[PDB]
Amino acid sequence: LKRDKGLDNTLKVLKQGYLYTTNQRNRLNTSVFQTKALGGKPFVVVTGKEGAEMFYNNDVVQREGMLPKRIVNTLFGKGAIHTVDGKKHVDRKALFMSLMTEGNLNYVRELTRTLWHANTQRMESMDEVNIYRESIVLLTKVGTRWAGVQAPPEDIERIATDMDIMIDSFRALGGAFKGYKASKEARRRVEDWLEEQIIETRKGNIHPPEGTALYEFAHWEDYLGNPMDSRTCAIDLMNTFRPLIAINRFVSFGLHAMNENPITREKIKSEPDYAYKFAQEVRRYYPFVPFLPGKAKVDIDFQGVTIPAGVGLALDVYGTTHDESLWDDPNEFRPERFETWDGSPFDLIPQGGGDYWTNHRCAGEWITVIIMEETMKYFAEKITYDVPEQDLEVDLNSIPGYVKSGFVIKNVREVVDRT
Ligand code: HEM
Ligand SMILES: CCCCCCCCCCCCCCCCCCCC(=O)O
């Protein structure tokens, strides 16, 4: 079992970012390697379809307790679905997935579309529109409402900003960083606010619609017949739309891709299939989630080595979505590749792999793809705009993946036939 030796390589991981794992595999001449990180802890990094299958074998791999505490404290929340395994988890996961009905999915499609269409005058009005900001604000409205949480217009900028600080909070992979305390306070504000809405739903003082996150989560009972304590229920209710709001990352990359590859825009208009393909390729191609931590429950024999009981595991997400034996020219933006993709649950894993119900795979993959479809169709078809000179670098050596400028646009003008 090959090592990238060192007492702790955390700072090295942060310096190489999304290309750390690839650089070590290339340099050590192997598909599997160990590295100590997060304070002396050894992690075996596994990749590919074969890495993803094993990583989501629940007989062999534990997730419970393997997220760094600082990331639990800021991104996901204490006691979040992300932090439990086994029966307790499968039961709770069922609640999340129960929101993802055909009707709720069309509802998020319709909200996203209507708000974009409604937001054109405002965007014509601005000297310039930062798409990272503008989309996070617009998706805060979609996401609160989709979750049955009433958020006043007056409060959406504040809320959006608190979400942004949280979503970003994995940048130090669990280390100390200067924005950490601000991250914890944004979460506290958002948790208090959702806890209030839960307590008040349970008292019958407010009335979220049947089938919304707020309603289902407030009234749900676990497999022992106990409801979630109010705080944990607010934490998990957030886990139902903070990540929806975080799609702003992908809206921004979306516009970068369409701008770099202007051909994609025409095909978004010409081919009703293509918006789906484009959205999938934005998720595969661009960096967001670097890797996921787990731990070996027992020795595992994998790719000619033994992973010892107790060692850490890191499923390489960016590595698997850019694996040259899974995708021809993994570093070329090419939506048409998804004409052939067979729907495998172990290659396209930018929001996790495996099974929605039994593993920790993202609950909101279909919402992510739906929202990106409607957003990209909006930007391709209903408006024209200019892209001024700006820093459009996406630095693959810096976690998290952002377009440096946020992706700024000007001279927005609705596309209308007036003849
Ligand atoms: C926008 C970009 C998004 C990204 C990059 C993302 C990524 C991820 C990743 C990597 C995981 C963990 C996979 C694992 O632990 O094996 C995850 C889990 C999760 N995702 Fe997302 N997701 C996004 C959007 C969403 C949306 C829109 C929702 C809900 C509407 C959502 C809900 C969740 C939940 C509740 C979990 C934890 C599931 C569990 O622990 O069983 N995500 N996501
Ligand atoms: C090479 C490695 C050693 C491994 C170190 C383990 C690092 C653990 C950090 C895991 C990163 C999780 C990032 C998840 C992205 C969050 C989803 C965005 C949507 C949301 O929840 O808001």
Nearest CA to ligand 2 atom 2: 314
Partner residues linked to 312 by β-bridges? 43, 295
- Resolution in units of Å: 2.5
> Does an H or E element contain 162, and which?
helix 156-167
Is 56 labeled as ligand-binding?
yes
Ramachandran region of residue 308, left (φ > 0), alpha (ψ -120 to 50) or beta?
Answer: beta
Q: Is 77 in the pocket of ligand 2 (CB under 6 A)?
A: no
Instruction: Please list every protein residue whose CB sits less than 6 Å from any atom of ligand 1.
Output: 81-82, 93, 96, 239-240, 243-244, 246-247, 250, 288-289, 292, 351-352, 360-364, 367-368
Contact between 113 and 211 (Cβ < 8 Å): no
Rounded CA separation 154/101 (Å): 31
**CA-to-CA separations, 291 to 320, 351, 383, in angstroms, rounded:** 10, 10, 36
Rounded CA separation 120/100 (Å): 29
**How wide is the angle at C-alpha 364 spanned by C-alphas 360 and 366, nearest 5°?**
120
Domain boundaries, the chain: 1-419
**Contacts of residue 153, Cβ cutoff 8 Å, sequence gap at least 6:** none
Q: Is 139 in the pocket of ligand 2 (CB under 6 A)?
A: no
**Contacts of residue 140, Cβ cutoff 8 Å, sequence gap at least 6:** 151, 156, 159, 160, 163, 245
Rounded CA separation 156/28 (Å): 49
DSSP state of 83: G
Closest by CA to 135, choosing from 237, 253, 239, 238, is 253
Rounded CA separation 413/250 (Å): 22
Rounded CA separation 38/61 (Å): 19
DSSP state of 350: B
Sign of CA dihedral 329, 333, 336, 340: positive
Rounded CA separation 116/412 (Å): 13
Three-state SS for 153?
A: helix
Q: Does residue 400 have a cis peptide bond before it, meaning omega lies within 30 degrees of 0?
A: yes
Tell me the best of 55, 295, 318, 351 to mutate to test the pocket of ligand 1, counting ligand atoms within 8 Å of each CB and taking the most: 351
Experimental technique for the deposited model: X-ray
State in Å: Cα 174 to ligand 2 middle: 9
Contact between 53 and 22 (Cβ < 8 Å): no
Rounded (to 5) percent helix, strand, coil in the chain: 50, 15, 35
Q: Is 375 exposed, middle or buried (0-12, 13-18, 19+ CB in 10 A)?
A: buried
Tokens encoding 340:
């052939």
**Contacts of residue 368, Cβ cutoff 8 Å, sequence gap at least 6:** 244, 247, 250, 279, 283, 351, 362
DSSP state of 63: -
Nearest CA to ligand 1 atom 1: 247
Q: Under CATH, to which class is 1-419 assigned? A: mainly alpha
